Design a binder for this molecule. Structure first.
Ligand SMILES: NC(=O)C1=CN([C@@H]2O[C@H](COP(=O)(O)OP(=O)(O)OC[C@H]3O[C@@H](n4cnc5c(N)ncnc54)[C@H](OP(=O)(O)O)[C@@H]3O)[C@@H](O)[C@H]2O)C=CC1
Ligand SMILES: CCCCCCCCCCCCCC(=O)SCCNC(=O)CCNC(=O)[C@@H](O)C(C)(C)COP(=O)(O)O
Ligand code: SF4
Lengths: 96, 340, 176, 94, 112, 112, 117
């Protein structure tokens, strides 16, 4: 910024931080508005051979739901899934 | 010249086909007439003289494009021409209860109506509606009433088939007649010439008058017919004012007005460097019973039935109702005495 | 995986107790907040001097729709109605007839800027880059009717803003 | 841009309010927005390109900035081939 | 003894093993009244017996929590109470009975 | 068929009677609180008309459902959840009369 | 005798004065696909459409102008119409009659089916 040294010292002491290092206002550090022309890459399906849509047709591979039980026509107890594992306290900062 | 086929269900978006130019649309009657035209989907070419801010309240009444606001000059006739050029119906509501400096009673009741009628005829306007009080007459003592009669004759002269409606006292939410009496309580006591014992009044409801105008526009037979709008019942001035003060629940302080004794009060009102408290002609209107003109057709001829004042008085005068009735709900009041 | 906010126990030693008693009695934390506000007072304000200074915008900005022309001057739109189909708010009404030259052109192209949501569709759908939301954003009107654009209004907007619109498209046409 | 008998500026679509029509009132103290540039005149003014191949391709210029590429047949000597999108005209020499 | 369970509204149980034993025994007693061939009875008995065996075998709260994989042991006792209530209502509902009614012809056909 | 609240038409009629009672006694309070300009008799006449609108119903479940809706509307009116606009919506004041004779319909528009 | 008319909230004019058409939509003759002809459709009667004065857009006052419903079978559509108290007209499904196609017939020795080209 354009602040005088005295004002910088005062604002930094009031903050308790060095505000000059990280300034909310943006200066020349921002990217240039005009940029060199881009050339975006093509995807996996841009091939001239072995690219039949039948192989990569996602939608046509969906199927109607499978019917596990239908009313209209020992065994171990089971759960919807294995029980969730307990989370572990973060190493970087366990307590804020 | 400009014939439009009606389309739609008569709603806000429907095309009624009545392209109209409501002069004095910003007025108490205009506020309702425009509303009805818009709800029918009638294109209303509103001529204004004031700031657009004042005309802003008319904007919501019509759909997009239905309401066109164009400034017009009261004296200049080219403004009248441009505002009636593409109109099949023109309604004349240019009345000033008091007399202004620039515009006198004659200016607004003879020259302006006659100019409008003449220019409407030049443009080819199919139907014209003119408004003049039933009391207004070529011999009526009130100058404004006399000017209204002269303008009525001139309007008939310029527009032979114009439907000149002749309404009685009009009351409504933004009335100047009922509200006048309600505010007389502020003015010391209740001034009552002859205690209002010689002034029978027949007030018509504003909505009834507006719908009457609209139906007259719609009905073919209305052309070249001097309609007269009369109230459902006739009341003595004392009775009406008493009922007003009852529904308002304001302390009735009726002191009669001796001509000479209260003439000094009227002179003081005139002495004011501003207008003589809405002129003395308004007080003359108060000092006059409604004329009974049964020969002229009435509301029922158009099919609209006049709504009784008693039912609509509560709505009109609840605004003047204060903590006087808010804190003390008590009960309601009784209908005014009907001199019929 | 998870972190405990709060869940901290204050020390009970006499020094810590004295410090916390000082904070309560001497309003230390309030003074810290006050100092923060003071520092922000001495920092440079972020206000830009509108209208003399304008906020940054990118070439892909979506503003007032503008029908464009070919360099020859012929109007680009070819009455495909693809824009009307994708329009998520049905703000585009298109009518077409074969014109005298025999080309497929639009007799009516109305964009109701009161129903449009400025989604950016149509600009990405039109096969001929006809309707292209221009850079203009300050086109407020005093009446509702002014915002119901017509084909003449859209073409006038395109003619007015073509210098900027062509440059913005040139900037962004490779990303599309 | 021709002017109608009422004095209105007729549009490139040919739209003009008739003297009987009441909708002309909307321009009483305002203006009717008409684009002076007419597409048909400008597309007419463009010179007809002469190409020596039976089939030619018009992209409208600018490559991806124009219109979808179409191939135009120019065998007919009587009539010039016209681009469906661009509207430019081409014909074989002689 | 943990200071807090960590979840508000859940308090540390001073005697977790005894509470769990009592709750599991009450669950088994309620399940006894359920008919023998009811699937609910069989599965709940299996789970309850496994839990009770683990509870009796392990004397350490942390090890028991690791073995049960039911979260903190207070959550386990809450879950046991919930199971007790479910079983008590199941006795009234009798879900083991056959289906009340077959659905209409195409009540579950999609697309229509 | 499972009954909503009444197993027979008579019981539904009893519920209708209760709802009518409640609306009837509520009407003057509505007029006073909402500062409506209608008379109490006018409102009660509208109530009667609304109740007779559903009279043709000949199924107990439909009657019960209508009663539920009536109760909800009455609760709204008893509270100030409904505004003066909502209360007056019953009185189609703004809407112009729609003629019902054939000749008037033929004149006005193409509608059947 | 199910009647939901009171509960639907539809105003009486559209309940009484509207005729609903129950049909299987015919194939768009421009295309040979038939997938759009496999489900019954319920469509209301057409009403007046007029031009808006301002822009010329088609304005309507019929709330059910765009309402169309899909039903698997004719009976389901009929039941829905009856429960809603709408007068209904049912158009029977039109199926393409079986045709006899022979590529050999294009080269008949004596019959007229021989193709010139
Ligand atoms: N009791 C009643 O209301 C009765 C009414 N009438 C007549 O009904 C008509 C309308 O009544 P109402 O609406 O209540 O009256 P208002 O006085 O409330 O409004 C009359 C209108 O006249 C316009 N006006 C007045 N003088 C001029 C002028 N010099 N130039 C342009 N415009 C002018 C006003 O516009 P602006 O406000 O901008 O000046 C206003 O819109 C009037 O002609 C009145 O005399 C007759 C009998 C009874
Ligand atoms: C401002 C006033 C607002 C009025 C609002 C009042 C309402 O909410 S109306 C709702 C009331 N609806 C009903 O009671 C449904 C009754 N249904 C019926 O079928 C009945 O008519 C019966 C069962 C046939 C009995 O009819 P009777 O009362 O004997 O004839
Ligand atoms: S940006 Fe507006 S006009 Fe364009 S497609 Fe989206 S909604 Fe329609």
């Amino acid at each position: 910024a354009s602040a005088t040294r005295v004002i910088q010292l005062l604002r930094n002491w009031a903050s308790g931080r060095d505000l000059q290092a990280k300034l909310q206002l943006r200066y020349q550090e921002i990217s240039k508005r005009t940029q060199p022309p881009p050339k975006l890459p093509v995807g996996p399906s841009h091939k001239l051979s072995n690219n039949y849509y039948c192989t990569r047709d996602g939608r046509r591979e969906a199927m109607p739901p499978s019917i596990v039980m239908s009313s209209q026509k020992e065994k171990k107890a089971v759960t919807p899934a294995p029980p969730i594992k307990r989370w572990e306290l973060s190493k970087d900062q366990p307590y804020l | 010249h400009h014939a439009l086929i009606p389309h739609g269900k008569g709603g806000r978006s429907s095309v009624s086909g009545i392209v109209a130019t409501v002069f004095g649309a910003t007025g108490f009657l205009g506020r309702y007439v425009v509303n009805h035209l818009g709800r029918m989907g009638s294109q209303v070419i509103v001529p204004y003289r004031c700031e657009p801010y004042d005309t802003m309240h008319l904007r919501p009444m019509g759909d997009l494009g239905q309401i066109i606001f164009m400034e017009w000059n009261g004296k200049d006739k080219d403004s009248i021409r441009k505002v009636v050029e593409h109109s099949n119906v023109v309604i004349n509501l240019v009345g000033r209860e008091w007399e202004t400096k620039n515009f006198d009673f004659e200016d607004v009741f003879v020259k302006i109506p006659h100019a409008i009628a003449q220019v409407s005829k030049e443009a080819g306007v199919e139907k014209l509606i003119h408004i003049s009080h039933l009391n207004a007459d070529i011999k009526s003592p009130s100058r404004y009433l006399r000017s209204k009669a002269v303008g009525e004759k001139e309007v008939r002269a310029a527009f032979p088939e114009a439907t000149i409606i002749k309404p009685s006292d009009i009351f409504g939410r933004e009335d100047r007649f009922l509200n006048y009496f309600a505010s007389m309580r502020w003015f010391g006591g209740v001034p009552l010439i002859s205690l209002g014992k010689e002034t029978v009044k027949q007030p018509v409801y504003i909505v009834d008058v507006s719908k009457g105008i609209i139906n007259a526009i719609k009905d073919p037979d209305a052309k070249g017919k001097t309609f007269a709008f009369v109230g459902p019942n006739r009341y003595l001035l004392f009775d009406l004012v008493q009922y007003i003060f009852a529904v308002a629940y304001r302390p009735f302080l009726p002191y009669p007005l001796p001509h000479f004794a209260y003439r000094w009060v009227g002179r003081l009102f005139e002495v004011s460097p501003f207008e003589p408290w809405t002129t003395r002609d308004k007080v003359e209107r108060v000092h006059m019973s409604d004329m009974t003109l049964p020969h002229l057709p009435g509301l029922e001829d158009l099919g609209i039935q006049a709504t009784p004042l008693e039912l609509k008085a509560i709505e009109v005068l609840r605004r003047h109702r204060t903590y006087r009735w808010l804190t003390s709900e008590m009960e309601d009041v009784k209908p005014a005495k009907t001199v019929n | 995986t998870y972190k405990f906010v709060n869940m901290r126990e204050p020390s009970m030693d006499m020094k810590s107790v004295t410090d916390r008693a000082a904070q309560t009695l001497l309003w230390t934390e309030l003074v810290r907040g006050l100092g923060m506000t003071l520092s922000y007072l001495f920092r440079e304000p972020a206000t830009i001097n509108y209208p003399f200074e304008k906020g940054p915008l990118s070439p892909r900005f979506r503003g007032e729709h503008a029908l464009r022309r070919y360099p020859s001057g012929e109007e680009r739109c070819i009455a495909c109605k693809l824009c009307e189909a994708v329009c998520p708010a049905q703000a585009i009404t298109i009518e077409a007839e074969p014109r005298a030259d025999g080309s497929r052109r639009t007799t009516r192209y109305d964009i109701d800027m009161t129903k449009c949501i400025y989604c950016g569709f149509c600009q990405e759908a039109c096969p001929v880059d006809a309707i292209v939301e221009g850079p203009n954003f300050e086109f407020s009107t005093e009446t509702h009717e002014e915002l119901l654009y017509n084909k003449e209004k859209l073409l006038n907007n395109g003619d007015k803003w073509e210098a900027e619109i062509a440059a913005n498209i040139q900037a962004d046409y490779l990303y599309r | 841009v021709r002017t109608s008998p009422t004095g209105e500026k007729v549009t490139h679509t040919g739209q003009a309010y008739d003297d009987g029509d009441y909708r002309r009132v909307r321009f009483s103290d305002r203006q009717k927005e008409v684009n002076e540039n007419f597409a048909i005149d400008l597309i007419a003014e463009q010179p007809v390109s002469e190409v020596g191949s039976r089939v030619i391709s018009c992209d409208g210029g600018g490559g991806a900035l124009g219109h979808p590429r179409v191939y135009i047949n120019l065998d007919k000597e009587t009539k010039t081939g016209t681009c469906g999108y661009c509207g430019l005209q081409f014909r074989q020499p002689h | 003894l943990k200071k807090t369970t960590g979840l508000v509204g859940l308090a540390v149980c001073e005697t977790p093993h005894e509470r769990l034993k009592i709750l599991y025994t009450k669950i088994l007693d309620v399940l006894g009244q359920i008919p023998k061939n009811a699937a609910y009875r069989k599965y709940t008995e299996q789970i309850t017996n496994e839990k009770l065996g683990m509870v009796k075998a392990e004397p350490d709260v942390k090890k028991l929590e690791e073995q049960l994989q039911g979260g903190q042991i207070e959550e386990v006792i809450l879950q046991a109470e919930n199971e007790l209530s479910l079983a008590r209502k199941m006795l009234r509902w009798k879900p083991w009975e056959p289906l009340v009614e077959e659905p209409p012809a195409n009540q579950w056909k999609w697309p229509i | 068929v499972k009954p909503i609240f009444s197993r027979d038409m008579n019981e539904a009629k009893r519920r209708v009677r209760e709802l009518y009672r409640a609306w009837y006694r509520e009407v003057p309070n509505t007029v006073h609180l909402f500062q409506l300009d209608i008379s109490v008799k006018q409102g009660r006449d509208k109530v009667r008309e609304m109740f007779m609108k559903n009279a043709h119903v000949t199924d107990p479940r439909v009657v019960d459902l209508l009663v539920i809706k009536g109760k909800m509307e009455l609760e709204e009116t008893i509270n100030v959840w409904k505004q003066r606009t909502h209360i007056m919506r019953f009185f189609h004041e703004t809407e112009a009369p729609r003629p019902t004779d054939f000749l008037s319909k033929f004149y006005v528009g193409h509608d059947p | 005798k199910l009647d939901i008319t009171t509960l639907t909230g539809v105003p009486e004019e559209h309940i009484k004065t509207r005729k609903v058409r129950i049909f299987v939509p015919a194939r768009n003759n421009m295309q040979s696909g038939v997938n759009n002809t496999k489900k019954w459709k319920m469509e209301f009667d057409t009403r007046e459409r007029w031009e808006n004065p301002l822009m010329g857009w088609s304005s309507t006052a019929d709330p059910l102008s765009n309402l169309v419903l899909t039903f698997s079978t004719k009976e389901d559509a009929v039941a829905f119409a009856e429960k809603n108290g709408w007068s209904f007209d049912v158009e029977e499904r039109k199926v393409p009659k079986p045709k006899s196609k022979s590529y050999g017939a294009n080269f008949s020795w004596n019959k007229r089916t021989r193709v010139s080209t």
